[PDB]
Design a protein around this ligand. Structure first.
Ligand SMILES: CCCCCCCCCCCC(=O)O
Ligand SMILES: [Cl-]
Ligand SMILES: [Cl-]
Length: 174
């Protein structure tokens, strides 16, 4: 009875790019098909004077046949009419790293503690997502406080993803 249509999902009201800038540690991830970032995932958000948001990310990614590499990624965000919904062009500093262009939604944040991100790469014909991913970010790499954890869990359920996350470990691999 829950609505899982992507078009129904609420996102962060009056999203403030400047307040969102700085270091975000991925605490949990819902993987898309053909997952890329594995763990040790840390993102750095910036906004420039024209108000355009960009980011970098580092994380371990496992090329198949189990080659471990620390990916260094770059992302640039094109605004839409919703201040919390973006198009993210991304690529690796190395040519061979994955590149592409994903929807990037800030579903919720309080700027100084937690953030919930969401991307639907491909819709189902009923408006639900066929291929999604989602990061939960923390300002503190040791994790969220209980109050924020509980808010995030609610947001995870609203995205119809709450059963599908895994924890992201940080152990200095990069
Ligand atoms: C968001 C700043 C980092 C640039 C985005 C690189 C992440 C793109 C791949 C995310 C999907 C995945 O990790 O499986
Ligand atoms: Cl709980
Ligand atoms: Cl669950």
């Amino acid at each position: 009875e829950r609505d899982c249509r992507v078009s129904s999902f609420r996102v962060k009201e009056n999203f403030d790019k400047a307040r969102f800038s700085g270091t975000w540690y991925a605490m949990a991830k819902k993987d898309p098909e053909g997952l890329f970032l594995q763990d040790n995932i840390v993102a750095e958000f910036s906004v420039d004077e024209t108000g355009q948001m960009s980011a970098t990310a580092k994380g371990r990614v496992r090329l198949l046949n189990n080659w471990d590499v620390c990916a260094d990624m770059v992302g640039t965000f094109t605004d839409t009419e919703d201040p919390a919904k973006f198009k993210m062009k991304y690529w690796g500093v190395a040519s061979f790293l994955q590149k592409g262009n994903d929807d990037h939604w800030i579903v919720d944040t309080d700027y100084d503690t937690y953030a919930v991100q969401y991307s639907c790469r491909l819709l189902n014909l009923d408006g639900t997502c066929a291929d999604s991913y989602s990061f939960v970010f923390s300002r503190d790499p040791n994790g969220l406080p209980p109050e924020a954890q509980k808010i995030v869990r609610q947001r995870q359920e609203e995205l119809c993803l709450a059963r599908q996350y895994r924890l992201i470990v940080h152990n200095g691999y990069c």
